[PDB]
Amino acid sequence: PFPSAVTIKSWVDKMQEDLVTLAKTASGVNQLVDIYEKYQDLYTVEPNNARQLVEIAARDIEKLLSNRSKALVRLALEAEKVQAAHQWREDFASNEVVYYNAKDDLDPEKEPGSQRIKPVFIEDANFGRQISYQHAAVHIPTDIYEGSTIVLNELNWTSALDEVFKKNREEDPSLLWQVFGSATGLARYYPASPWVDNKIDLYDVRRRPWYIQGAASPKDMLILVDVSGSVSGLTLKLIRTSVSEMLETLSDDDFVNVASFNSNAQDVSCFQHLVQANVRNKKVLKDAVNNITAKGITDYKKGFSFAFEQLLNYNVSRANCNKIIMLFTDGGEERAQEIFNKYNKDKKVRVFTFSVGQHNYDRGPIQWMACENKGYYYEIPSIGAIRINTQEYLDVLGRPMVLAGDKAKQVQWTNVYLDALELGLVITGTLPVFNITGQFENKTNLKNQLILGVMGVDVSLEDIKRLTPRFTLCPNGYYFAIDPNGYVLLHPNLQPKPIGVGIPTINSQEPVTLDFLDAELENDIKVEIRNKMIDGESGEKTFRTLVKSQDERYIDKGNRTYTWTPVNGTDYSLALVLPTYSFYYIKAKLEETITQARYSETLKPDNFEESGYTFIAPRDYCNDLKISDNNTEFLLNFNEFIDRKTPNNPSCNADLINRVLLDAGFTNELVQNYWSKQKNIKGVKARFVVTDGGITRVYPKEAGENWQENPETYEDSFYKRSLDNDNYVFTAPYFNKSGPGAYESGIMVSKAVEIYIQGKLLKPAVVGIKIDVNSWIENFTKTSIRDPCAGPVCDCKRNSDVMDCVILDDGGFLLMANHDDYTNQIGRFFGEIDPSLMRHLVNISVYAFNKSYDYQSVCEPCITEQTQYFFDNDSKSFSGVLDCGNCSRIFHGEKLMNTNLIFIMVESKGTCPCDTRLLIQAEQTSDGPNPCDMVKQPRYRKGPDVCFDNNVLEDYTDCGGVSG
Numbered sequence: 018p019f020p021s022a023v024t025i026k027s028w029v030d031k032m033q034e035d036l037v038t039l040a041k042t043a044s045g046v047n048q049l050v051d052i053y054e055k056y057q058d059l060y061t062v063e064p065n066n067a068r069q070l071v072e073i074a075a076r077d078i079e080k081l082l083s084n085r086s087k088a089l090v091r092l093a094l095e096a097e098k099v100q101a102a103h104q105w106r107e108d109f110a111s112n113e114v115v116y117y118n119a120k121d122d123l124d125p126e127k128e129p130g131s132q133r134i135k136p137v138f139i140e141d142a143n144f145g146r147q148i149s150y151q152h153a154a155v156h157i158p159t160d161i162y163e164g165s166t167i168v169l170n171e172l173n174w175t176s177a178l179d180e181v182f183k184k185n186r187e188e189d190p191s192l193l194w195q196v197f198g199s200a201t202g203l204a205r206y207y208p209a210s211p212w213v214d215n216k217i218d219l220y221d222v223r224r225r226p227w228y229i230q231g232a233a234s235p236k237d238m239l240i241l242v243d244v245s246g247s248v249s250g251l252t253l254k255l256i257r258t259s260v261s262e263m264l265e266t267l268s269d270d271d272f273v274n275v276a277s278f279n280s281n282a283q284d285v286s287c288f289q290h291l292v293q294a295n296v297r298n299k300k301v302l303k304d305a306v307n308n309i310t311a312k313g314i315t316d317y318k319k320g321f322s323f324a325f326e327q328l329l330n331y332n333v334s335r336a337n338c339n340k341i342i343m344l345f346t347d348g349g350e351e352r353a354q355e356i357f358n359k360y361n362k363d364k365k366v367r368v369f370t371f372s373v374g375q376h377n378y379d380r381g382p383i384q385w386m387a388c389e390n391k392g393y394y395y396e397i398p399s400i401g402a403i404r405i406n407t408q409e410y411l412d413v414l415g416r417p418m419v420l421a422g423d424k425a426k427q428v429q430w431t432n433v434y435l436d437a438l439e440l441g442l443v444i445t446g447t448l449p450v451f452n453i454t455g456q457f458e459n460k461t462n463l464k465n466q467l468i469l470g471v472m473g474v475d476v477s478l479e480d481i482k483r484l485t486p487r488f489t490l491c492p493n494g495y496y497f498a499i500d501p502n503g504y505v506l507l508h509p510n511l512q513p514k515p516i517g518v519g520i521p522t523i524n525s526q527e528p529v530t531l532d533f534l535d536a537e538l539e540n541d542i543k544v545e546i547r548n549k550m551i552d553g554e555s556g557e558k559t560f561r562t563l564v565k566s567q568d569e570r571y572i573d574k575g576n577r578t579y580t581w582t583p584v585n586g587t588d589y590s591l592a593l594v595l596p597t598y599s600f601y602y603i604k605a606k607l608e609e610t611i612t613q614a615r616y617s618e619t620l621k622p623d624n625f626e627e628s629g630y631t632f633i634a635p636r637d638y639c640n641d642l643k644i645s646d647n648n649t650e651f652l653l654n655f656n657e658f659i660d661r662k663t664p665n666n667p668s669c670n671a672d673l674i675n676r677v678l679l680d681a682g683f684t685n686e687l688v689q690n691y692w693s694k695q696k697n698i699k700g701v702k703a704r705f706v707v708t709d710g711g712i713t714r715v716y717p718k719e720a721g722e723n724w725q726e727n728p729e730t731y732e733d734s735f736y737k738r739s740l741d742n743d744n745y746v747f748t749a750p751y752f753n754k755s756g757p758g759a760y761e762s763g764i765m766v767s768k769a770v771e772i773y774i775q776g777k778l779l780k781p782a783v784v785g786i787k788i789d790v791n792s793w794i795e796n797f798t799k800t801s802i803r804d805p806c807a808g809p810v811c812d813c814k815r816n817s818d819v820m821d822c823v824i825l826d827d828g829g830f831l832l833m834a835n836h837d838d839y840t841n842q843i844g845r846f847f848g849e850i851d852p853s854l855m856r857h858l859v860n861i862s863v864y865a866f867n868k869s870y871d872y873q874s875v876c877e878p879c880i881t882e883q884t885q886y887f888f889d890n891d892s893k894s895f896s897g898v899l900d901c902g903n904c905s906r907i908f909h910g911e912k913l914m915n916t917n918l919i920f921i922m923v924e925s926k927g928t929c930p931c932d933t934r935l936l937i938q939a940e941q942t943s944d945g946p947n948p949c950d951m952v953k954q955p956r957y958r959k960g961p962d963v964c965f966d967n968n969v970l971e972d973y974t975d976c977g978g979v980s981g
């Protein structure tokens with residue numbers, strides 16, 4: 018039968034009291050608070066003024082980037098002067114240029130004008146590779162011969178850069194890379210290191226995003242593809258490959274749209290006006306281009322009239338400078354002077370014409386189109402010419418900024434991208450290098466309107482993370498930074514993996530561009546905060562948001578405070594997220610050499626038998642102490658270091674060490690004085706304590722092998738979840754995993770320690786226990802069933818045919834049930850067990866869901882869809898009547914007040930058949946949002962305001978037709 022709602026409410030109270038009392042007593046919660054008050058005077062509570070913290074960090078980042086920019090400035094000055102003083106030799110006799118080619122074998126045991134250097138690489142932990150600080154290394158790509166007269170002159174005159182490289186490194190020993198990408202192809206980076214590692218080097222410095230960023234200004238490109246009949250066959254494949262490679266040379270500040278025309282022009286993809294060259298809009302355009310067919314009769318006057326009209330659309334967001342048309346055709350007879358006289362008569366749009374394929378057609382008109390319209394003419398006769406002939410239009414685009422003089426020389430920082438030499442997430446500052454031969458005397462300006470190359474220095478994101486310390490904050494507080502496009506420069510949720518672009522089709526060069534809204538859970542207030550950060554404003558915003566847990570299975574409803582300020586000097590904006598309870602932190606005292614030894618003798622490796630197996634967080638306390646992935650090794654190193662000399666020494670962090678020692682003392686006093694009195698308890702398997710300082714202790718020595726949590730305290734999902742909840746939190750175990758399930762370790766319940774010192778509020782630690790399944794399953798089958806109620810069971814027996822007692826958590830996962838089959842599936846989502854009660858619970862708003870996208874995820878055969886369920890109405894009694902096909906299941910649900918637990922009682926599963934559409938909470942591979950709809954309603958961005966797109970002094974004589 019189905020007992021009364023009052024009866025279920027009476028049953029749940031006994032189990033709630035049992036669980037709450039057992040978790041309270043077993044893991045000391047009042048004892049730690051009492052310890053924290055009674056050992057006062059050993060620490061002090063200091064404020065976290067968010068306004069000051071964010072400004073200090075912003076000025077630190079500003080100084081770092083200005084240090085980085087000074088090196089670029091002096092490199093550019095020296096390179097310009099040295100090239101200006103160069104004399105063009107044409108013949109080199111035996112050894113005349115001495116350089117280290119970065120792709121040469123280190124032991125050849127064996128050229129036209131070059132003598133190799135045999136360098137000595139020692140090591141450097143700052144880089145990870147083997148480097149030589151003695152000289153610079155040269156990369157010359159595979160196609161370009163290293164004996165050319167234009168390469169040997171570069172290799173000679175650029176040898177003067179090594180002194181400046183050395184001077185920069187000696188003034189700032191933290192410089193990572195100093196590359197000079199040259200317009201001839203070769204690159205010179207100062208710490209001479211072998212080139213990376215089939216295995217065909219396809220690297221070209223003239224296509225890397227930093228070079229393209231520094232070589233021109235943002236563009237409004239419109240590719241016009243000819244798809245008439247005559248381009249059928251090889252020419253079409255060359256055209257598609259060329260268009261894809263051209264699309265690869267586009268940044269997020271650039272806007273592009275691809276059109277095609279046989280006899281009537283049309284858009285190749287769903288986009289209709291112009292889209293910024295994201296990593297995903299570009300994918301859509303590439304996929305659309307790879308599916309075009311050639312049929313018809315060419316009509317230039319209808320394709321150009323289409324391109325010029327899409328370059329006039331101002332309802333949409335665009336770069337608003339450098340308006341260019343790239344015509345991919347083979348050859349024709351029409352030049353269409355009327356169209357150009359009608360649309361482009363003041364010559365505000367450049368036209369670049371490509372004669373793709375191996376054929377024999379008139380090429381005069383398409384050369385004339387480039388010559389008349391301030392453009393250039395290119396020829397792609399095979400696959401090997403695609404790269405070079407698609408990367409060259411930047412030479413044309415850089416003329417107006419070269420003529421701008423010492424006003425186009427501004428340092429610009431790129432998007433976050435993976436370094437070529439396996440260094441991780443880095444950003445690059447760039448500065449163009451101009452040609453100034455014959456400028457001291459008024460001699461030459463015809464060829465001087467071309468950059469020599471681009472300077473570049475790399476700053477790693479680990480540097481920026483070092484400038485923003487995070488250990489005076491709670492685990493829930495963090496920094497993050499936003500550039501004008503909205504992408505994150507800093508975020509806890511940014512991983513060193515390429516951004517997924519779509520579902521991975523069956524059978525490291527792209528930037529890691531992750532938007533702020535894609536790194537967190539989007540919110541109406543967050544869309545406003547992000548716009549204010551982009552605009553370059555500063556303010557505070559305290560509001561109730563929706564935070565997702567570390568393990569990506571739960572959601573908590575936390576109250577956070579966003580404080581942001583612009584990184585004055587650059588275009589970035591820094592923000593600091595802090596919850597309400599994280600406005601104060603514990604600062605340890607100096608104490609005395611007596612107390613240091615007594616606290617540090619507790620975490621001796623032989624000593625965690627009377628004290629409980631101890632973990633230590635791998636945070637850098639001293640320069641000499643080395644971080645290890647095996648916590649035993651790091652704990653031994655930490656112990657021997659503390660034994661050596663004194664706990665307080667130079668080349669260390671006094672605050673970190675003192676905090677760790679204070680936490681060790683508090684934890685040891687707790688574990689001894691309380692847990693040592695009661696060696697074994699009936700319903701617990703292990704008592705643990707995790708504290709902010711870095712220390713994790715599990716009381717049973719044998720239970721330490723089952724502890725699978727991260728030794729870093731600031732990265733434990735249960736700690737972060739428990740901080741946001743003023744009650745007990747049940748963390749469901751993992752289901753179908755190689756580790757020990759909820760039969761040898763137990764089910765974890767955690768409660769956050771809250772201490773009231775002065776009027777301040779602090780949460781410095783979290784304790785908990787792992788409840789054994791057997792004691793609780795034995796306690797579950799007797800505290801809810803009445804014995805003399807009836808012959809047939811009025812509630813669940815050990816294996817009840819009809820009754821289906823089952824208790825869930827705040828995320829819909831299984832924790833315990835009556836049935837043996839159910840109990841065998843502890844830690845599984847209830848949707849995959851009973852896929853009808855689950856969806857009805859969602860529908861009657863027992864639960865709620867909120868779905869997001871993961872872009873940095875890996876798949877087996879990629880963007881991934883994620884789902885998390887959370888309590889919404891937060892009211893107690895949930896009873897109703899679920900309807901199956903031609904049958905009715907009646908259910909009652911009651912929620913424990915002190916824990917995030919729900920007791921759901923359903924009449925019977927077998928009696929009434931419902932359709933079994935499984936509701937899966939696990940992450941599912943999926944395509945991202947439809948790009949068409951997103952580009953119909955784009956996000957807010959503030960593009961660069963400086964652009965050099967026209968100059969009256971520019972010489973258009975180098976059209977490219979008469980030059981070959």
Ligand SMILES: *[C@@H]1O[C@H](CO)[C@@H](O[C@@H]2O[C@H](CO)[C@@H](O[C@@H]3O[C@H](CO)[C@@H](O[C@@H]4O[C@H](CO)[C@@H](O)[C@H](O)[C@H]4NC(C)=O)[C@H](O)[C@H]3NC(C)=O)[C@H](O)[C@H]2NC(C)=O)[C@H](O)[C@H]1NC(C)=O
Binds near residue numbers: 454455469
């Ligand atoms: C920065 O700008 C300066 C000037 O603005 C530039 O310096 C000039 O560099 C060119 C190299 O391209 C030198 O070219 C001279 O011109 C003669 C005559 O053409 C060349 O002799 C032949 O030229 C043909 C083509 O006409 C060609 O096949 C090949 O270059 C030569 N062939 C044979 C068989 O000899 C020479 O290349 C060269 N002459 C001499 C005597 O060196 C100019 O002389 C340079 N100008 C000045 C004022 O010195 C410089 O390259 C730019 N920076 C960079 C990095 O390119």
Ligand SMILES: *[C@@H]1O[C@H](CO)[C@@H](O[C@@H]2O[C@H](CO)[C@@H](O[C@@H]3O[C@H](CO)[C@@H](O)[C@H](O)[C@H]3NC(C)=O)[C@H](O)[C@H]2NC(C)=O)[C@H](O)[C@H]1NC(C)=O
Binds near residue numbers: 099113173175177
């Ligand atoms: C481009 O290549 C040129 C040829 O190798 C280099 O020019 C040569 O540099 C040498 C320095 O190593 C000069 O030697 C010195 O020159 C001084 C002149 O003041 C004289 O005393 C001597 O000739 C000599 N002295 C000493 C102490 O070695 C060569 O005169 C000079 N010119 C040649 C060989 O024709 C350029 O240095 C090189 N460019 C760059 C940027 O390195």
Ligand SMILES: *[C@@H]1O[C@H](CO)[C@@H](O[C@@H]2O[C@H](CO)[C@@H](O)[C@H](O)[C@H]2NC(C)=O)[C@H](O)[C@H]1NC(C)=O
Binds near residue numbers: 331
């Ligand atoms: C969008 O661009 C079009 C032209 O590219 C602008 O032209 C107007 O289009 C609307 C559509 O019904 C009409 O008011 C007229 O046909 C056009 N008005 C003119 C030319 O003055 C249109 O104004 C742009 N959108 C907005 C909101 O301004």
Ligand SMILES: *[C@@H]1O[C@H](CO)[C@@H](O[C@@H]2O[C@H](CO)[C@@H](O)[C@H](O)[C@H]2NC(C)=O)[C@H](O)[C@H]1NC(C)=O
Binds near residue numbers: 075079582583585586
């Ligand atoms: C960028 O410049 C502004 C002003 O040029 C700095 O803001 C000033 O801060 C002082 C106190 O530090 C105030 O007295 C001024 O009123 C502020 N001026 C404003 C807001 O216009 C700002 O600090 C600089 N950027 C950074 C990161 O420090």
Ligand SMILES: *[C@@H]1O[C@H](CO)[C@@H](O[C@@H]2O[C@H](CO)[C@@H](O)[C@H](O)[C@H]2NC(C)=O)[C@H](O)[C@H]1NC(C)=O
Binds near residue numbers: 539563868
């Ligand atoms: C994200 O989660 C929030 C939290 O529930 C959802 O916002 C609520 O949505 C329900 C309807 O599903 C509304 O009745 C509430 O008024 C919403 N709350 C607030 C504060 O607005 C939200 O729908 C979820 N999904 C997304 C995409 O935000």
Ligand SMILES: *[C@@H]1O[C@H](CO)[C@@H](O)[C@H](O)[C@H]1NC(C)=O
Binds near residue numbers: 188
């Ligand atoms: C900037 O450089 C100076 C000297 O080059 C150095 O003392 C200072 O610490 C640097 N600031 C940084 C790296 O933020």
Ligand SMILES: [Ca+2]
Binds near residue numbers: 245246247248314315
């Ligand atoms: Ca044709």
